[PDB]
């Protein structure tokens with residue numbers, strides 16, 4: 001994957017909530033491997049799905065995310081952007097979110 005492009009997109013679309021792989025809103029639902037595993041989402045395909053459709057307090061970002069209330073009120077992300085993000089998150093989680 002394009003690490004730098006992924007990092008740039010993550011840093012503007014995700015980082016304020018998932019700061020350095022964390023979760024400033026919801027303890028226990030970080031992007032670290034152990035939390036992803038406990039939540040049943042430690043795969044690229046599952047990370048993509050939750051990014052696309054959202055879950056609870058997390059908005060989803062997909063073009064076809066529905067209904068409006070469960071999705072970002074900002075611009076939707078393209079499929080290719082969400083794929084890049086899912087690959088980036090999986091890679092970072094595998095690496096332990098290096099600083």
Ligand code: HEC
Pocket residue numbers: 010013014015017018023025026028029030031032035036039041047050051055056057058059061085086089
């Ligand atoms: C705050 C407004 C958020 C933004 C912006 C993004 N995410 Fe998020 N995310 C947020 C919450 C509150 C949660 C927990 C939802 C729940 O009730 O389970 C999540 C969860 C995820 C997960 C799953 C993590 C886990 O179960 O341990 C992933 C993979 C995830 N979020 C990814 C992600 C990406 C790629 C984002 C940018 C496009 C993004 N989130 C934005 C809060 C917020």
